[PDB]
Every structure is written in structure tokens, then in C-alpha cells.
Amino acid sequence: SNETLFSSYKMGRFDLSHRVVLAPMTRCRALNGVPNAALAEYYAQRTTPGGFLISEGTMVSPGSAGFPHVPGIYSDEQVEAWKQVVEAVHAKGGFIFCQLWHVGRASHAVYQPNGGSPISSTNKPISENRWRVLLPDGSHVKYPKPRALEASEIPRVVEDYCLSALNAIRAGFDGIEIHGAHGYLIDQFLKDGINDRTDQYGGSIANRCRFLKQVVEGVVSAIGASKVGVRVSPAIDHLDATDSDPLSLGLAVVGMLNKLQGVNGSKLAYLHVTQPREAKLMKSLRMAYNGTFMSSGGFNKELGMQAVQQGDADLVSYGRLFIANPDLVSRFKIDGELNKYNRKTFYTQDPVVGYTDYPFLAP
Ligand SMILES: Cc1cc2nc3c(=O)[nH]c(=O)nc-3n(C[C@H](O)[C@H](O)[C@H](O)COP(=O)(O)O)c2cc1C
Ligand SMILES: CCCCC[C@H](O)/C=C/[C@H]1C=CC(=O)[C@H]1CCCCCCC(=O)O
């Protein structure tokens, strides 16, 4: 009860100076899928010594994008271009994980090779009321009808995750995070409100987890458990990703990861859980997971401070506030003022405006 957001922490290999984490955040500045100086600049600004960072969602294969100008890690060109961003982070003594991202059905023909259909667990489109895919021209259109995968096809998509993880390390990354949240590919298998499968990848809760299990297994096999994080969001309806019982789902995922750590012999870097914005559900998964717990969603300083003090979380990741405040860790420390975030420049392509030009705190 004497631990705070500013207490040091040992994350297996990595000795952290504090608990404030940069949440993964799509910003769409990686023009044409390739990272650049602007990304290096933006992440560097946000780096503190012993500070932990999570990169924006990063493509694992052609077709895995549902956003314009998001970066990839499947090609050599991408690997080489990422090096500057990581080196920049390492220079300032921070740690960085590449989030491995497949959007599944949350895509468009535009982002698909040969203009194909996005792949998912189901053939059902995302409903057309609340949700629209954003296109390179800035317009918003309806999500198309996806193609459900053959069972035989899945081991290949898992191999895409392996290569991406192997590239990430080769590019200098300290590790990777599996994006299994927010209604993207993995979540489309996890949630029974999407996964209408007949086979071993659907039905029972154990069956809905089988996809993630394999993805986590293959990646851990490739680069070691200690360099792997997993992000899930059991209670988030984004893109029609509902479950009949989110608490049982979360606990089935938590349970899966525990029972995997015996099979491997080593612990994962962390489990990353996002809240929408009961609170029993979070505390429940925490007690249940044997390892580091990074909690996310709607946090400020006081909430983040009390989460650590009470043992609800080891680490707390910040999204919206970290965009507006490159030196957020310092601002929290001295209880300083916070810059407000501008929504309009979240997903614009400018290297500077709304991206790196958020001012540091004055001396
Ligand atoms: C502009 C923006 C982009 C985001 N992109 C991602 C992403 O690529 N991958 C991911 O797992 N979460 C993404 N998120 C969700 C954040 O990781 C985080 O969970 C969310 O911002 C809620 O936390 P907060 O209240 O501190 O902002 C994004 C959020 C925002 C606002
Ligand atoms: C001005 C707001 C634009 C919408 C941006 C929104 O935060 C969506 C972000 C998506 C992009 C990548 C992701 O991984 C998604 C984040 C999921 C946010 C879910 C909302 C949580 C809640 O229910 O409070």
C-alpha cells in the first residue's frame, strides 16, 4: 500500500522506473505502411528512462490493415525503417513493444490484396449503424461482408504472427504485444456475439480461445514468453464484439495463459486489459492471472495511483492523455497541468500538426 505510479518494477527482463505506460495507439503517420522520422520523433518525445512504451497497432500481413497509413512489420523494408524509431527510444532509455495487429473483418477491399474480402471467423459483416471503416481519402464507408476462414488456413495466419514477432526483435524491439482486443481478428474468435463457428474454433469458450492460444503459442515459441504481452478486452462492444458472459470469457483467457506458462516454463511479459468507459471483473482477472497485470481505459493520475496502491494493477497504460502530453510521466509526478487532446488530428497524416507539436511542460 506504499507503492505508487512512480515505484520501480521488474518486468521479467526489464527493470522499469515507474508504472506509467504508453498505450498502443493508431495515429496513421506511417505513410504507405513504412515508419519514418516523425514516428521516431513522436515516440522519443514520449520516452522516459526505464519507461515502458507500446507501439501503435502494426500490420502482420498484407490484408491486416483497417486504417490508412498504419505501419507494418512483415517486410524487410518495414524492419529497416523501424530501426530508427526503436534506437530513438533506447537512446532515451525507454522500453518498447511492437503491437501485432490484424483487423480481420474490420477492413475494406481497399486494404486487401487483389481487392479481396477481409478475413474473419464468420461470414457476417459488422452491422452498418454505428460503425464505419476509414479510407485513405478521409471518407467513412460501411464494413463489407468478410470471408470466414477454413481451419486449414489458420496455421498460416499464425505463421504471419511469428514472422512479425521475429521481424520485431530483428528490428530492435524489446518484445511484442498481441492485439486480441476491440473486435479485431482475435476478438472475432473470442466473442460469441461474432464467432458463429461450427468447428473446433467456435462454440465452447475453450474453442473460442483456441485461435488466440495458437497465436500466443507460436509467438512465444519464436521469441520467448518473456518478450510477449497479450491485450484483451472482454467487456468492450466495439465493432459488435459482445459476449454473453464477459467475465467467463476473460477468465477463460486468463486461465489459458496460466496453463500455458507451465507448458513453456516461463512467464509472459504481461497481460493487458482494457476497460470500457462491474469493476469486480477487472479485480477478478487480476487475482486470476499469475503474472504482471497492465490495466487500461479511462485512467487519470488518481485512479492510476490507487490501482497500484490497492494491488489492482502492476502497470497502467494511458491513451488519450499521452497523445496530448509527451511528458505525461513528469506531469503526474509534480501534479502539473495537462494539455487537452485534439480529436480531429488523431488520424491525420501530418508529421507535425497534432502529432509531435503538443508542447512540453515549461521549466
Ligand atoms: C487514436 C487512438 C488510437 C488507438 N489505437 C489503438 C491500437 O492501435 N491498438 C490498441 O490496442 N488500442 C488502441 N487504442 C486504445 C488505447 O490503447 C487505449 O486503450 C484507449 O485510449 C483507452 O485508454 P485511455 O482512456 O487512457 O485513452 C487507441 C485509442 C485511440 C484514442
Ligand atoms: C474522436 C474519436 C474517434 C474514435 C477513436 C476510438 O478511440 C477508436 C479507436 C480504435 C482504433 C484502434 C483501436 O484499437 C480502437 C480502440 C478501441 C476503443 C474502444 C472504446 C472503449 C470504451 O468503450 O470506452
At 212, which CATH number? 3.20.20.70
Helices 37-46/76-91 angle, 10° precision: 30
Say how many C-beta atoms besides its own lie within 10 A of residue 199's C-beta.
14
Strands, DSSP E only, in the chain? 9-11, 14-16, 20-22, 52-59, 95-101, 119-120, 133-134, 140-141, 147-148, 175-180, 228-232, 270-274, 293-296, 315-318
From the alpha carbon of 317, which atom of ligand 1 is closest? Answer: 26
Q: H/E element holding 114?
A: none
Query: Rounded to whole angstroms, how far apart are CA atoms 209 and 225?
Result: 18
How far is Cα 194 from Cα 122, in angstroms, rounded to an integer?
7
Please indicate the experimental technique that yielded this structure. Answer: X-ray
Rounded to 5°, the CA angle 76-212-317 comes to: 75
Q: What is the resolution of this structure in A?
A: 2.6
Q: Tell me the Ramachandran region of residue 182: left when phi exceeds 0, alpha when psi lies from -120 to 50, beta otherwise.
A: left
User: Is the CB of 65 inside a 6 Å radius of any atom of ligand 1?
Assistant: no
Cα dist from 42 to 3, 98, 229, whole Å: 29, 15, 22
Residue nearest to atom 1 of ligand 1 (CA): 346
Separation between Cα atoms, residue 67 and residue 65, nearest integer Å:
6
d(CA 87, CA 76): 17
**Whether the Cβ atoms of residue 305 and residue 4 lie closer than 8 Å to each other:** yes
Among all residues, which ones are annotated catalytic?
184
**What cell numbers appear for 25 in the block?**
495507439
144: three-class secondary structure by DSSP: coil
Spacing, Cα 318 to ligand 1 middle (Å) = 8
Number of domains in the chain: 1
Atom of ligand 2 nearest to the CA of 344: 1
Query: Measured in angstroms, how far is the CA atom of residue 64 from the centroid of ligand 2?
Result: 18
Ligand 2 centroid to Cα of residue 309, in Å, is 28
* Boundaries of domain holding 228: 1-363
Residues with CB under 6 A from ligand 2: 26, 182, 236, 238, 276-277, 343, 346
- For the beta carbon of residue 227, count every other beta carbon within 10 angstroms: 23
**What are the angstrom distances between the C-alpha of 188 and each of 71, 127, 312, 322?**
22, 14, 27, 28
- Atom 13 (ligand 1): residue with closest C-alpha? 25
